[PDB]
Write a protein that binds this ligand. Structure first.
Ligand SMILES: Cc1ccncc1NC(=O)CN1CCC(C)CC1
Ligand SMILES: Cc1ccncc1NC(=O)CN1CCC(C)CC1
Lengths: 304, 304
């Protein structure tokens, strides 16, 4: 028992972190095989950040301008290319610690672990989710750019995020490993306001199942609801609409606890309409939405 | 910006996890140098758990009864001894991935990361703290025994916790790496009720400094207090008494924010007496006490 915000073990990703310096900017790179991935804004100066033309800025850069340091040993750069908002630096040495990996683009609501890094060195690991407005609420400082977000399926690391920037509101924006930003964000020092940060309903429901499994049951009520009725209440509370697919994904949790998904929706409806009354659920005073149904099943079953 | 419950990167500890089987019990062991550390309850059966006499049970065990598996290769056990509540299994091979390490016994309030494991394999990493009643609120299942808690100072891993058991109330008990339990807990299947889980005041204050640093400032008030006045309010709310040592440890945070420690105590006093009024601080609806002043400084400065 006990339910914690749990990150994936970071070792496989730690073995991929390198330092990339270009000009006077130092950030992090991800070394997989003979390629190092890093944000393209590494080639920018103070005056470039405002309205950079990366194709133009990249012409003035050569292979020897990208300084790649793995641990404290230098990697030789034999090629460089720009793929969307990331640079792919081909090095002469394949990463000996390269795990089995995939590049995946995640959907809003999906969770992942971040291994925050500074100067190619890991400083910490935390769990977070892709918000429905395509921001992430990370914990990043200057120099953390190039830190990655990932998932693990036993031995395969699915890389889903690369950190690029902090928006003026302190929230975070980044790309998948193909260089495409999540959301409408652009790697420019400009006014980019995020959209509505709605609550990931399916995740909240999965965490209510996690609470019942671990003994916090006070919130279970004598009511039920429909998808349409629940969604009227969810729209009012800035909660994402619940679909039949979400209900299906919750099936394993409904089966283990014997609580119908729509009964759990009714319990959530009353928590939304009445508050917690100073009470807590899994040590939290708000409804937690950064655990997917898959994360709850994994933590409650002990997948390694 | 952004403040997350951040765990230490787990790679150095992942390289130490092994599977220990004795009889029909399989748990985790920590392989450091030529010694494997694991809970002594690995030698127990169903009938032993109630009132085990580990010196007696250990006589019937030999080196070849302890099955140590590192990855999927077997380690030869050439010696075994009992140190308090942990077994030290001397193996013929030194762990090639042994990091620089220390064994330290932490005080209540101190935080650490746990690398939860099943069958010697890491399943996740989370951050938690030694409660003032010497329990921990982990996330552990059957088979997680032998999972460790640790801190890292650049390259040195300070091992502080080894998981041994779940109390009947779902909370967790364990030992330091010398086999001494934190608290009055004993490795027996018996009624052991935990004492008062008081709030770690100094940690809450440090997290209020973390909130001010990241822009959540609504809770800052026009008041101040004394240690004696604050402690009258803290005793009433089951908060640990604040000492001058805690005030000193908060010095770096007081200096960076320009907010006197006693001013922050007065802000905490009003949050205790008035609640949050449906508002949040660092995305939380309760006062978080699992970040030490050192953790806040580390996360806000980016120590690697
Ligand atoms: C300071 C900080 C904190 C947390 N995360 C990231 C950063 N840095 C940036 O976002 C810098 N920024 C400059 C303009 C570039 C086009 C994109 C990168
Ligand atoms: C099931 C579980 C969940 C989370 N953490 C641990 C466990 N297991 C135990 O605590 C088992 N227990 C049996 C009696 C022994 C003296 C000590 C170990």
């Amino acid at each position: 028992s006990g339910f914690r915000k749990m990150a994936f073990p970071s070792g496989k990703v730690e073995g991929c972190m390198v330092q990339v310096t270009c000009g006077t900017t130092t950030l992090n790179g991800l070394w997989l095989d003979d390629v190092v991935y890093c944000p393209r804004h590494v080639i920018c100066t103070s005056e470039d950040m405002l309205n950079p033309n990366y194709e133009d800025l990249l012409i003035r850069k050569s292979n020897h301008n990208f300084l790649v340091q793995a641990g404290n040993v230098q990697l030789r750069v034999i090629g460089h290319s720009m793929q969307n908002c990331v640079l792919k630096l081909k090095v002469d040495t394949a990463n000996p610690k390269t795990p089995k990996y995939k590049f995946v683009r995640i959907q809003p609501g999906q969770t992942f672990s971040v291994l925050a890094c500074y100067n190619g060195s890991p400083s910490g690991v935390y769990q977070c989710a892709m918000r429905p407005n395509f921001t992430i609420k990370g914990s990043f400082l200057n120099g953390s750019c190039g830190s990655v977000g990932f998932n693990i399926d036993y031995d395969c690391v699915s890389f889903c995020y690369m950190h690029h920037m902090e928006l003026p509101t302190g929230v975070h924006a980044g790309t998948d490993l193909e260089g495409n930003f999540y959301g409408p964000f652009v790697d420019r020092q400009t006014a980019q306001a995020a959209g509505t940060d709605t609550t990931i309903t399916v995740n909240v429901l999965a965490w209510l199942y996690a609470a019942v499994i671990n003994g916090d049951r006070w919130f279970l009520n004598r009511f039920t609801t429909t998808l349409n009725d629940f969604n009227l209440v969810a729209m009012k509370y800035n909660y994402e609409p619940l679909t039949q697919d979400h209900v299906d994904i919750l099936g394993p949790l409904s089966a283990q606890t014997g609580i119908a998904v729509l009964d759990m929706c009714a319990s959530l409806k009353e928590l939304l309409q009445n508050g917690m009354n100073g009470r807590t659920i899994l040590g939290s005073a708000l409804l937690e939405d950064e655990f997917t149904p898959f994360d709850v099943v994994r933590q409650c079953s002990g997948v390694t």
